[PDB]
Amino acid sequence: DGQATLLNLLLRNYLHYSLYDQAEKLVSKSVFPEQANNNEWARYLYYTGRIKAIQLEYSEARRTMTNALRKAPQHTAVGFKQTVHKLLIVVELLLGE
Amino acid sequence: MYEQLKGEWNRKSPNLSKCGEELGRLKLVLLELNFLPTTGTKLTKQQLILARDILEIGAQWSILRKDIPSFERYMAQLKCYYFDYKEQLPESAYMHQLLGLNLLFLLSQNRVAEFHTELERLPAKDIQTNVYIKHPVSLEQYLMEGSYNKVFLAKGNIPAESYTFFIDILLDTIRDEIAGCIEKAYEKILFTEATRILFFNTPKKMTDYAKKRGWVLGPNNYYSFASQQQKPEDTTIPSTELAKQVIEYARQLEMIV
Amino acid sequence: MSEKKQPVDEDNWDDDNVEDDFSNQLRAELEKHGYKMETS
Amino acid sequence: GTYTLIIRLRHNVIKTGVRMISLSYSRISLADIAQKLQLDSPEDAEFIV
Amino acid sequence: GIISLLDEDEPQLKEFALHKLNAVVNDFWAEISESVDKIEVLYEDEGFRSRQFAALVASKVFYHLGAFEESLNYALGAGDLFNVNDNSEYVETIIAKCIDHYTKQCVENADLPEGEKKPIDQRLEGIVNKMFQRCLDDHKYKQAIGIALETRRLDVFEKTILESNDVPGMLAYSLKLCMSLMQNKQFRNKVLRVLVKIYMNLEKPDFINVCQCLIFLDDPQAVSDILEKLVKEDNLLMAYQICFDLYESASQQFLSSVIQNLRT
């Protein structure tokens, strides 16, 4: 639970900014927070999805964009589900399908 | 104010006996004040604007001497200086023609993930303004598809500066690309068409490539060995891999997990 | 439950695939044929 | 801020074009395909293809 | 970004770089986390004035990345600059590896000490007995009784029978604490035989521990020796519980073997 929150909370301005922590997030051990309660675990897959988006989607992360979409609750779409619904097939337009 | 530099920096001293005094002079900058970004004392800029301009001209003649491994040390520390949020020059007469110069050498480095990871600092400067940085990204954008002739138009159609060391790496890394593009299923090409697809009239560079690869020198002839024959009709490699996979089905079918 | 923070703020599909191939291709075919009777 | 990813789609558009026409026509001149794809240049329409 | 100036070949810019490796070792710590590991280059180099500080910060960056043995070895060879501080959240990191690899090596050394023993890097035991002296000087001896077992070293446990703590139940009850969680016979019998002679060299020699230990220990002559000390001492009121706990808890083979040393 410190393994969980302190990594998306680490991420959210690194994405917003431009730090090198993406390969840091490759070599990070805490890429698993081990069943982080379907909120941090759910959005975490999106926050690591835009990582390989800006580092050149090779069809690797559309399954985890899709996974981040299918792990999201019954709240609304304009929170972030609009944004994952956008980027999720942005990258499929990068593929061709 | 410990300047020592302001006489032979603009007049050309290409690898003369200025450069060792310049490097130990930068050591004298290190003994005075660290290039740690000096978070306090914002009024003290002489360690930042002046010494940074020293470090970017020291970046600048590094391509003039063609010192590649030190060049990214200089330019990397420059990018670490524009990493600072402290109110500085927002840019200069150099920041486009140096950051995008790093984008153009880095593009010649054939590291495209780093080519796109470096674009997360200058947004609006992409298309809506800053044509001198629009030129490398539209350039490599043309290198993405089969835009070749437009790339060799850009080659020369450089508006910014020389960029010669970069467009010669670019002159090569496309020489092997055409030198592969002859190797597709084509007809007998005469000694004019593929002779003029690059930028040559008749040197023995067509003998360099015609003896390097096939499409051999013939009776106005380039030879097509479009064989592509041997590789199909493999059952045994599926008769091993599928022999793995079917057992892998049987493991997670009856054996309790 | 469902805290969900704010960083940002049939009947429909076969017609949508008709819009996929056929979003805007000549719309009202009624006179183009009669404009090709004299040219073709 | 997706614009830096939107900008690279022209590669994928021309892949859609060459897959579409290469699937549709069998024996087609290169002096037609740049004209239908509004590429303005057959001489590198050899090269994209 | 400061990692870029590791090609100077002047042994002062390496020192100027390691000026900036201890305070800013959290932000571009992530940068030089896996990318550059030229610590061992200058560390094994003939270039001195570095190799001292560098294995410290290698023992910082390789720590969090799961290379606990890499930070353990560079923790060993890092020098006086390494162990100069114990005022962070990092002495806890290095003792939990060094005492660990110490004593889990010393179980194998408890098997075979003779030959192929430890090449101690001069603090691999130095902070064992040093932090042990911290446990002695920090007034705690319910733990200093414990790590003295954990080190698999006998004479330092023999040293802690005379310490800043006194001996009312200590080094007497410690044996009740050891008979329960006592693992085998091989580590039991040596400690058991080494404590009960200084129990005889104690001011008042206890008798139930030296009877009970010796029937736990199979020494059918030493109880005839201290039994001879009670014949010479001439009091059968204290030559009593040494003898009827001996009959009560001893066996027929043990009494029929000790009868030769008792009648002689």
Curated annotation (Swiss-Prot), chain B:
Modified residues (Phosphoserine): 13
Annotated GO CC locations: cytosol; nucleoplasm; nucleus; proteasome accessory complex; proteasome complex; proteasome regulatory particle; proteasome regulatory particle, lid subcomplex
Crosslinked residue numbers (Glycyl lysine isopeptide (Lys-Gly) (interchain with G-Cter in SUMO2)): 204
Leader sequence residues: none
Keywords: Isopeptide bond, Phosphoprotein, Proteasome, Ubl conjugation
Domain PCI, first and last residues per copy: 69-238
One GO BP annotation of this record: proteasome-mediated ubiquitin-dependent protein catabolic process
Domain of life: Eukaryota
Family: Belongs to the proteasome subunit S14 family.
Role description: Component of the 26S proteasome, a multiprotein complex involved in the ATP-dependent degradation of ubiquitinated proteins. This complex plays a key role in the maintenance of protein homeostasis by removing misfolded or damaged proteins, which could impair cellular functions, and by removing proteins whose functions are no longer required. Therefore, the proteasome participates in numerous cellular processes, including cell cycle progression, apoptosis, or DNA damage repair.
Subunit (UniProt): Component of the 19S proteasome regulatory particle complex. The 26S proteasome consists of a 20S core particle (CP) and two 19S regulatory subunits (RP). The regulatory particle is made of a lid composed of 9 subunits including PSMD8, a base containing 6 ATPases and few additional components. Interacts with DDI2. Interacts with TASOR.
Protein name: 26S proteasome non-ATPase regulatory subunit 8
Species, as recorded: Homo sapiens
Residue numbers of the full-length protein present here: 94 to 350 of 350
UniProtKB/Swiss-Prot annotation, chain C:
GO biological process: double-strand break repair via homologous recombination; mRNA export from nucleus; proteasome assembly; proteasome-mediated ubiquitin-dependent protein catabolic process
Subcellular location: Nucleus
Species of the source: Homo sapiens (Human)
GO CC terms in record: cytosol; integrator complex; nucleoplasm; proteasome complex; proteasome regulatory particle, lid subcomplex; protein-containing complex
Gene: SEM1
Name this polypeptide is given: 26S proteasome complex subunit SEM1
Role summary: Component of the 26S proteasome, a multiprotein complex involved in the ATP-dependent degradation of ubiquitinated proteins. This complex plays a key role in the maintenance of protein homeostasis by removing misfolded or damaged proteins, which could impair cellular functions, and by removing proteins whose functions are no longer required. Therefore, the proteasome participates in numerous cellular processes, including cell cycle progression, apoptosis, or DNA damage repair.
CDD domains attached to this UniProt entry: DSS1_Sem1
Keyword line: Nucleus, Proteasome
Tissue expression pattern: Expressed in limb bud, craniofacial primordia and skin.
Alphabetical list of Pfam families matching this protein: DSS1_SEM1
Keyword Lyase: no
Keyword Nucleus: yes
Record family assignment: Belongs to the DSS1/SEM1 family.
Signal peptide coordinates: none
UniProtKB/Swiss-Prot annotation, chain D:
Residues modified to Phosphoserine: 29, 41
Lineage: superkingdom: Eukaryota
Disulphide bond pairs: none
TM regions (residue ranges): none
Protein role: Component of the 26S proteasome, a multiprotein complex involved in the ATP-dependent degradation of ubiquitinated proteins. This complex plays a key role in the maintenance of protein homeostasis by removing misfolded or damaged proteins, which could impair cellular functions, and by removing proteins whose functions are no longer required. Therefore, the proteasome participates in numerous cellular processes, including cell cycle progression, apoptosis, or DNA damage repair.
Assembly and interaction partners: Component of the 19S proteasome regulatory particle complex. The 26S proteasome consists of a 20S core particle (CP) and two 19S regulatory subunits (RP). The regulatory particle is made of a lid composed of 9 subunits including PSMD3, a base containing 6 ATPases and few additional components. Interacts with UBQLN1 (via ubiquitin-like domain). Interacts with ERCC6.
UniProt similarity note: Belongs to the proteasome subunit S3 family.
Protein name (record): 26S proteasome non-ATPase regulatory subunit 3
Organism: Homo sapiens
Range within the parent protein: 390 to 438 of 534
UniProtKB/Swiss-Prot annotation, chain E:
Name listed for the protein in its UniProt record: 26S proteasome non-ATPase regulatory subunit 1
Family under the similarity heading: Belongs to the proteasome subunit S1 family.
Self-association state and partner proteins as the record states: Component of the 19S proteasome regulatory particle complex. The 26S proteasome consists of a 20S core particle (CP) and two 19S regulatory subunits (RP). The regulatory particle is made of a lid composed of 9 subunits, a base containing 6 ATPases and few additional components including PSMD1. Interacts with ADRM1. Interacts with ZFAND1.
Organism: Homo sapiens
Function: Component of the 26S proteasome, a multiprotein complex involved in the ATP-dependent degradation of ubiquitinated proteins. This complex plays a key role in the maintenance of protein homeostasis by removing misfolded or damaged proteins, which could impair cellular functions, and by removing proteins whose functions are no longer required. Therefore, the proteasome participates in numerous cellular processes, including cell cycle progression, apoptosis, or DNA damage repair.
